[PDB]
Amino acid sequence: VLSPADKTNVKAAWGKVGAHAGEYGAEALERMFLSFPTTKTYFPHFDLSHGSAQVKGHGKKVADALTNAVAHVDDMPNALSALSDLHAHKLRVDPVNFKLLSHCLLVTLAAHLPAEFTPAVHASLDKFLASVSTVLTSKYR
Amino acid sequence: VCGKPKNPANILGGHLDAKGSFPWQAKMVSHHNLTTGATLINEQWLLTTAKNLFLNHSENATAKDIAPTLTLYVGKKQLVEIEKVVLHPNYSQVDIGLIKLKQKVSVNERVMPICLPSKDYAEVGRVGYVSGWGRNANFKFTDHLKYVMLPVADQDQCIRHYEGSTVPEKKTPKSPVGVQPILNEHTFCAGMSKYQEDTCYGDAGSAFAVHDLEEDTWYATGILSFDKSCAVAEYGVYVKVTSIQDWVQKTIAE
Amino acid sequence: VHLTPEEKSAVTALWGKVNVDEVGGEALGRLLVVYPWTQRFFESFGDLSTPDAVMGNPKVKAHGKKVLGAFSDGLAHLDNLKGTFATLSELHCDKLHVDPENFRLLGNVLVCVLAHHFGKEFTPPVQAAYQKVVAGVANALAHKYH
Amino acid sequence: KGADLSLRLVDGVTECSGRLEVRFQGEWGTICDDGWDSYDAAVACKQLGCPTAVTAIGRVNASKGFGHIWLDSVSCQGHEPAIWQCKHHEWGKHYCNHNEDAGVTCSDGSDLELRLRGGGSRCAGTVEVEIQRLLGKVCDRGWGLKEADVVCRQLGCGSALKTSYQVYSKIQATNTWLFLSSCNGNETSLWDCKNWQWGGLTCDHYEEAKITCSAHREPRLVGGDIPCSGRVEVKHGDTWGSICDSDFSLEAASVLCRELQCGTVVSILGGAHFGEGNGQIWAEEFQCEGHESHLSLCPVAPRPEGTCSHSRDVGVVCSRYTEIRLVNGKTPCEGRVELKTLGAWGSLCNSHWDIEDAHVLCQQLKCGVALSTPGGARFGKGNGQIWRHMFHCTGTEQHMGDCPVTALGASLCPSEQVASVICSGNQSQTLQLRLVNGGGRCAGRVEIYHEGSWGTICDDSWDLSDAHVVCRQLGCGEAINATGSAHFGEGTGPIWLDEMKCNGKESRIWQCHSHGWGQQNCRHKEDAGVICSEFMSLRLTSEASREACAGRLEVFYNGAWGTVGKSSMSETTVGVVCRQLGCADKGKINPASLDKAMSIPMWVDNVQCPKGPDTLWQCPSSPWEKRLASPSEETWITCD
Amino acid sequence: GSNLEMRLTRGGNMCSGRIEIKFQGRWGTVCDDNFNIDHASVICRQLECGSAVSFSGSSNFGEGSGPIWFDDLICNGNESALWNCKHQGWGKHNCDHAEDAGVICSKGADLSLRLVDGVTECSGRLEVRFQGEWGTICDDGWDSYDAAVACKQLGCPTAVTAIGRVNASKGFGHIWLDSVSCQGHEPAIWQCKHHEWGKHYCNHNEDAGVTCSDGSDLELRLRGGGSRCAGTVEVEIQRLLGKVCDRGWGLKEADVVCRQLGCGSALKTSYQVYSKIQATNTWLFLSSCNGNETSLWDCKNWQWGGLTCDHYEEAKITCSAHREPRLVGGDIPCSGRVEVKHGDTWGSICDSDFSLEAASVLCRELQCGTVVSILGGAHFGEGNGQIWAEEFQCEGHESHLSLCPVAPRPEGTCSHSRDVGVVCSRYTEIRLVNGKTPCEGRVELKTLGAWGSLCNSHWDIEDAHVLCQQLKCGVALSTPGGARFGKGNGQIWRHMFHCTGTEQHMGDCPVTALGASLCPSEQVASVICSMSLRLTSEASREACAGRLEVFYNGAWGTVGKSSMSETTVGVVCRQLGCADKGKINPASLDKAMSIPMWVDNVQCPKGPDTLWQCPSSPWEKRLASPSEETWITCDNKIRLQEGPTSCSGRVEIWHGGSWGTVCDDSWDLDDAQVVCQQLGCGPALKAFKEAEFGQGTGPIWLNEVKCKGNESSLWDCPARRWGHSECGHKEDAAVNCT
Ligand code: HEM
Ligand code: HEM
């Protein structure tokens, strides 16, 4: 999908997030561990408590990965290939979880950034995170 | 008997199979708890794809490795065993296997095979119905059977949507999805819905069913092969049944 | 499982503060905009294409309002949801044949519009509780047609 | 109708209760309770011709059905003549199981009983119900304040205060549960709450909802001279009993006076001080911590079997005076203010009167805000004595007895200067500097609440004119001493103002010339404090004993110590002295030691205080008069 | 023949579109495989459409339909017709219809550049008119080469070129060009390399802008840091004031700014509370340039306006030139009156406003070591001009005086008669003589105003290493023995250093010169780098009056009465802690005991704190005559200041090497009685408080003094810990006794 309109909107919205993307990524993860405790079984050795450095940094990683993705959004699978194989094959992460974290990440951006969350962006942002969580899942087996 | 559903029709979209209008759809589950589709082709045989059958397996696997790891359901909750499986001798171009049952399934209102066509129905614009047990918008295996209506898309448009050019030596993988579909003369393509509905993980093995209104008969024109679309890429790709009819008849005779 | 008292209490007190004449209709029309295929069930309304049309059409908010009320009734009795919604579940499920997964899609977009209005005061524990509620709701609403 | 339909009940307590089975084409089968509501039950009860005043859903002693479920999603309007004329999907097509088979019990109301068991009274305990002579309990699933309040109301015990269990005899588990989904709360009975379920369903492995209502143990005070003083008697169940002085702590008396809205505990009095009680003595110790809102929530301990006698009944005195009235108003919320003191009503003096005092008065009388304080005997002067009590409210107190009161030395009130008020009469009408650690309102470290915080003043430029401004602003008279160098100890927080140079005419400290808010170089070791002329202090001075609490009683006032005259001094006054010093309840007046070479100034005599006040400062007396006492007029006392 | 027709289709005009060729009555297209500006030039000439502007694949005009007539053409562009370009033949191609080339020519394009909403005609948002409509360009990748091309095209000055939109709104409508990145020599922006026309992801919040300047209007200043060298960085560009955002702001960028203002280096992002200035709504963003630049404008890719930053507020700097100390009028550079330049003016500091810790930090920043003494009363001469009214209330651990907090003096005039002077501990006047470089040579030290050669008897390579390292010459390679560089014609210094080899300065090593052995004239050091004191009285308990005795070589002995100066007396009394000065008493004739003397004629300059540093005669044990014994009395450790008599006044006591005051906390008539009585004045009449005799200076040495009035000395009274006071000088105790 992802028309020009969508792409533009997602870029413009993800820019205005900027350096706060990392802390949101962690806040997003925290919500996820609170909402769906089963995903904790994917992070055995991590400290999962509030604002844990391990959570906070992994969140900074998912944030920068995402910013990278939006920097060149017209080819996602080359950019994310190594993460494709990392989550897909080695870690074998069950595809429901990407849609979980996707939605928690939408709640998080909504809560912290009320003014930019007009419907058009909520739309193309959900499409965008769809397209990514797909590109990560399609090497599942 | 071909093509006579008791309740004929009028994936992350609408069109719930409420009345059970696709009695030829079967649900196969792999050893690692994945649900995919299959298509009843006679009272003892079903069609599916080789890739579906090769799930939870190495690329170098035989028939006796794969056979005991499968689980198969027909109708609503009726368990059905398996006598044997016959893979197509070629799998780089014909992603297809046939499963043969030990006994004949009882035929009724809820379980009935779709007919194999004698005509080529894959003309651009014809809208067919694909029913499936695959994953929904939450990327979870659907709780109820659903179906969508999709139109057949231009083959060249599809080739361009996946591959740089239609000319062989200029092609480069440009699939918005990591895994590349198999495209050749044995396949055709079909666009997604118009209310933005498409197929996704687990829909492979389902029939591209065409309802022929002159005779009121439903025909399996394609078998969905590349099931990794998620309304993110543009077209699903189906194997042309006309191009494997002879192999099917031979396998059935044998 | 049963809801711990301070979850249900923070939920109800917040729903008290929730303006009941607008949010539901915006959540509904938002479901319409992000996942346009649901328009099929509501397509008697008119054009569901632009965001201004969806947000303006009085029947969109009329339905959202009635559904949000039904949800208030849910939050009212959280242990027996099935019986309370059994008929509504029949109306949507038996007559309309809406796929019950779009309930959660709406419930999720709902929590989003919820979060949209309440900003920072809608905290991860409060979200996790409302998710539990709109889950139990989605299930009870999905109870028909096994 | 159609193809042979009939309805019956099976395995009922009566022929019109039980699991409901419908015969269709000759065969009986059951119906699922999916969507089964009170209209459906009412239609069923009506069809059998039984009373429909009370209709329960569910299967009591009724087995699970077998075979077909003929009707599903039954939804009646209550007017249908038969259950098979209500809405349903179709016949024999269902998803229900025989665990969801509907049942009914139809009753006229004569057999449903409700009682509380195991909570020490009939109005606290586990909620037990008896329906068709079957005992069960109400489940806490869905149990809120509305359901508890309906149950509490049915027993006439008022409102439910707590869902708490109290360790007592435990009751045999009833295997049958009542589920209430919700009532509005205006119902007269829990059974009048809608859509309640009797048995069948399992609640949840947590059960046994227990309650304590506000009428579980009800205290009262009897036999004191004011409503906030007397012997404590508590009704537990329907019987009143006294409590022993050993079984009633200071914390329990504090809880009682707060619950009774009588303020703070002033004294506990053993030995049947208010007379012996009569009848039963409670054998339970309340081991409450004292922060508890009600004695019903205080833990009770079993008596070690000690026998108390009514000679040991506990008495309590709390701090509030409540007997204030308006006289000669056109409304009960306007009039001249009359106060009852020493048993006599008299007009209050207006010499220290304002709108905050009138506001507090209007609020205590539940008359809203004060609208005006008419000067003059607009409501008449009254024919009685004029009380010269000066209240010093902040305007935030709930009761006049919570306000500081001064009566010693108060100036003569002219007959026309009587206090009066007009209140709004509608409870919908609405509308700082302090001294700390000085032992009274008029001495201590000066702290100002400004910009949301308390802060101190530096002693830099701190002079007598600044202290005079402070003392005048508080009504404390003249400044006697401006103490620097943290004489009363260091304060805490910001120093707001520094290098104060008041001319002594400014109405507010921040109108004086200063360096400005928060610009200061001082530390709390230099925090200024004041002692004004209205600072009063009490002591006993003895020449012959190290006993700080036995001696001649001297008060410091207006800068000097002086004796109190023995004239009209009562044993009540001696009790006050002994309590105020924390020595004992009683004491004796000793003959004065003649061996003293020095006449002392006396300030006041004939001081007569009722029972209740804790300090001599609260005791009415003669005006301030500095005279030389003779040694024979000196009061020397020894407390026990 | 004449059966060849050309047209452009779907490009909005006849001079833009997909290439369609009519051959044998059928239209068909041409693939863009191996397509270039020469093909477009042929097409644009054939249509009389002017110059070529753009070529594009099918993306801009959509796919064509029919035959592809030509493929992999190789023309130079000097052909009368496109079918005269080199081709493989009609209907020979490898292309599909997704590669159908299209072109836009200048007559179908219509390009113009203007500035909009500028402060001047040479600043503003860049707008291009294309085919009649104006639109903006997104700043994605917009750089200084693009700005230089734009400035050149406008005929504006190109000496200084800024990017960004100053007070210019967001554009509307089309964004025509995106991520243009040329080489900078191109004559027009649409002649630089760019993406396909009309294909972009930018929105109208991203619009490129330029400001072209000759440099005469760019101003930089610091405000609110009390001087031109500290404060918020304010910029004025085209007469618009703004501020630099701290995003990407490091010490390197700050150092570039500090250098541009000639304030030396940036020391701290510190803020200094001094002026609360109106928020400028306009921010400058930098992008990590190296720090060796001469001007912030020389930094690459700096952006002027257009972006909002949130959490990145005001960037302020304090450079070392905020306050620069020096010592003036002392005999050595590390001794003198302290003058500090604050802003561009030098000022003296008042003796009340300059602590021991501040003098230590100041000389350390100046690398002069530790404080030895503070001297009031213009001891080093009067300062000139303005006196700073600010107290440094520093703790003494700060790396620079610019970092210690300062409080403004409450209203009061200090005069130069109260200018503070400080001497700290390091000796810096050491030199190498007759080296081939200034960092090798014979070592000469200047003492008593004269340069002299150091003796080599203990001069090792570690000492020489430390000296050359101090001189930044790396390691010592050798210490050549003998006067290889000559002996010099002066006196040879017999000073014995005792370095560990880790010291930074020669003045940090322990030095002994008293009694030091002689040195033969030929044994001079050269290098090529790559004791107890007492006063003895027999009759009185008085630690501060007596015969001067030194413990040395296991025995106490007298010093011989000879050549001792008041400077020497000051040194002994300071080391003994008695006073700055004293008088030599006549010796008591009543002592019959002759004492061993160890050393005499000890003569030290001003500066040394210990006798070990004082030059003398060699060690010689002789018997003193009673007439040769030196008895001295230094004045008292306690004085009265600013009183009408020597026994009334503010109480000052000498401790820890400084004068200090006494807090009036517990101060009573018996304490004052003891101090005056110790001075031998009669009974105390009054103990005054609150600095009745004026405010004192320096540390409040004693607080909560609690004498009994029968102690011999205030040092014998119970008190709080020395030098720990919560009092201010407002609380200075004073006395008036009879
Ligand atoms: C947009 C979604 C996601 C992105 C961009 C992403 C990307 C990443 C990144 C950057 C890392 C860390 C790599 C490193 O530090 O070397 C990582 C690790 C990991 N991810 Fe994700 N991830 C996503 C979603 C998820 C989710 C939802 C889960 C599980 C519920 C998951 C499972 C894991 C695991 C188990 C690891 C290993 C942690 C580690 O090695 O430190 N991923 N992923
Ligand atoms: C997820 C939360 C939902 C709530 C709380 C809810 C509740 C309700 C209620 C109480 C009504 C009115 C019932 C009546 O008029 O008798 C209603 C109307 C309706 N509902 Fe829903 N429902 C939900 C989901 C849905 C969804 C997702 C759809 C379709 C995609 C749907 C389809 C409809 C339709 C079509 C109507 C209007 C019927 C008409 O106009 O004739 N419901 N909803």
Ligand SMILES: *[C@@H]1O[C@H](CO)[C@@H](O)[C@H](O)[C@H]1NC(C)=O
């Ligand atoms: C207060 O001042 C009075 C005189 O005005 C003096 O007699 C008295 O001692 C003072 N109180 C003190 C110093 O505590």
Ligand SMILES: *[C@@H]1O[C@H](CO)[C@@H](O)[C@H](O)[C@H]1NC(C)=O
């Ligand atoms: C920009 O500033 C200049 C100089 O003050 C002014 O003339 C011009 O109108 C401004 N443009 C705006 C505010 O768009």
Ligand SMILES: [Ca+2]
């Ligand atoms: Ca019903």
Ligand SMILES: [Ca+2]
């Ligand atoms: Ca070619």
Ligand SMILES: [Ca+2]
């Ligand atoms: Ca550029």
